[PDB]
What we know:
The structure is a homodimer.
Chain A (H helix, E strand, L loop, with lengths): L2 H4 E10 L2 E8 L5 E8 L5 H16 L8 E7 L2 E7 L6 H8 L4 H20 L2 E2 L8 E3 L8 E3 L6 E2 L10 E2 L6 H4 L7 H16 L9 H10 L14 H10 L10 H4 L3 H4 L11
Amino acid sequence: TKFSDNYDVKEELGKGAFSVVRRCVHKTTGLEFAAKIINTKKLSARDFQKLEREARICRKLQHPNIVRLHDSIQEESFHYLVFDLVTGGELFEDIVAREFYSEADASHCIQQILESIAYCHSNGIVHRNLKPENLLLASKAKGAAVKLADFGLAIEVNDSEAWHGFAGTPGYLSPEVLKKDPYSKPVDIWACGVILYILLVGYPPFWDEDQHRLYAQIKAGAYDYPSPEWDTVTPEAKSLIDSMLTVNPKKRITADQALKVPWICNAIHRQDTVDC
Amino acid sequence: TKFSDNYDVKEELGKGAFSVVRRCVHKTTGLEFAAKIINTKKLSARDFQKLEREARICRKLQHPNIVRLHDSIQEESFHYLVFDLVTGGELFEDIVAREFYSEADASHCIQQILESIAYCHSNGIVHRNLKPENLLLASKAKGAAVKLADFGLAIEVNDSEAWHGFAGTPGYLSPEVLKKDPYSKPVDIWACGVILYILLVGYPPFWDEDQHRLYAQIKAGAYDYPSPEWDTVTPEAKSLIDSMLTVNPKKRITADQALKVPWICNAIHRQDTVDC
Lengths: 276, 276
């Protein structure tokens, strides 16, 4: 063990409950990492379970758009989790700063998120808690990759849908989850459309200080494209938001499908093969 | 023991019943501390219990905005409590001096208090006796941190609400406590809103030389924003005072939530994740 033996600890990048993230360097190589240090002694059973969940999953996943969990050390009373070093902050604090994005900037950004997602989805991993406070920018540099994080809710599924409990973030929840129907991968895609909408204008498709109504609207599929903002927005951008924001999850588009839309790439289109 | 062996005692910073606070220096290091010296011989059982209460709790808590209890020595007939040295006095005597604060100055100040509070709240610690006579300014220097004190009432709680007796300070008590309902962490948040209001204008939301009426008003939620003072005050400052001064504690905002309000930080906002 002895993280201290292989890791030089630097400054603090932030903190949470029973945890602090600090910058740290590896000794022999000199590589750079964001290291999440947690109080194992002060953990609760459910907190620990989470810990073992995110841990194990992220360990499986390797991708440019996925904050890589590189290591996991246990030193007596503290558990260390070695993460990609990121320095661009959340995509949230970036959206707010610029208020909103062009269409070009949106497609690129989204395309990235679509890929990290399609990937998890190709590894039986659903994230469940997709949102801009969980999307991180490699660095301040422009074009800097967007990297997916906080898998504390992420789950492993097979080829069939089933109820996995109720968890997520208000504004991003899917119909199928609120309806308490059996759900799967498209739940994340639903959050995508939401974030897209946000990216395009800087405000949500659904909102309301009443959760009931909020939820009624979500399950209804109740959003639109208010003028004037949405006036100079193309149809190919709206149409896409539709296919993601599809209430029937069975008819909702997949990440892989969505990564084949010309508004992402750039008549005839790319059709997925069908085998029975 | 022999505090005298490790501590050079300097001048008197003030005094209370069976106690005097004097400035003192550590010998080998030379560090500076406010040292509360108490007559153990002249203590009553309830006074002692308190002593052991504040003691043990503060010992747990470490924070920039929390007067750190560094040590606790017992010398025959006197018990010493080694505290952070503070020299700015109470935030009370500062408010009175300047009468009241700008909005910027208020948010900063409050944000600090919100953090010390959120912290205790994250360590099962509720303060119960929150007020400006208990908030201390590190030094006379401007920007000097505000540090929380007098935990003589502070209590330890779990995840559930229950009656913890009736204690606090008139003008700051919460509805739930006066209603003698089962109470918890939000009781402090209620005192926050109160202090905020005060910070913004230099007079309380609730007051009355009749306690019954005073209390009737508190439980009622009976305050307002009288003109002209409150005329140049933003809505984001009032609205916030509302969410803290929420009579239904279940619907009252949390410190952590409140530390995510743009009037504190500086459309879209930061949503807390929900797991069941």
